[PDB]
């Protein structure tokens, strides 16, 4: 509705019998492959990201925000626990750090 991409803001400009909108939008770029999982299995419990997504660079698991790569250590502060590991399809084993 307000340009191609994720809309940030817009500027109006007057035109003869018309209006010109300068739509400022955010476009993602320089994407990178990662190995992802729906949940993390730890201590018999399933951990799900509060706002982000589990990614892996090949050996180590992190959680990052969805629209920008910013890897962080999977802790209890950024994950929540629901159920055991027997239900979620594709759950992987990784440690969950406790601050």
């Amino acid at each position: 509705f307000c340009g191609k991409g994720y809309h940030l803001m817009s500027f109006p400009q007057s035109a003869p019998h018309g209006v010109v909108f300068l739509h400022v939008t955010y476009v993602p770029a320089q994407e990178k492959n990662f190995t992802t999982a729906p949940a993390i299995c730890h201590d018999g419990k399933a951990h799900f990201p509060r706002e982000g997504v589990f990614v892996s660079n090949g050996t180590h698991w992190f959680v990052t925000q969805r629209n920008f790569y910013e890897p962080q250590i999977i802790t209890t502060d950024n994950t929540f626990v629901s159920g055991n590991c027997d239900v979620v399809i594709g759950i992987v084993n990784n440690t969950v750090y406790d601050p």
């Binding site: 300068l22 955010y26 476009v27 993602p28 492959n33 190995t35 992802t36």
Partner: protein, 50 residues
């Protein structure tokens, strides 16, 4: 010629891989929308008859 619809892109889908952006582009685009016309009035009697 028969026009092409787009460049062909195959998305590398698999059940455990995701693509995460590592950078961004601030893109400004134009959208032109007409608002009004020229306000024209026609004297019907003068146009038909003078």
């Amino acid at each position: 010629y028969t026009m092409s619809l787009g460049a062909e892109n195959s998305v590398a889908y698999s059940n455990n891989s995701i693509a995460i952006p590592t950078n961004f582009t601030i893109s400004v685009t134009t959208e032109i929308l007409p608002v009004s016309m020229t306000k024209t009035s026609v004297d019907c009697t003068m146009y038909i008859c003078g």
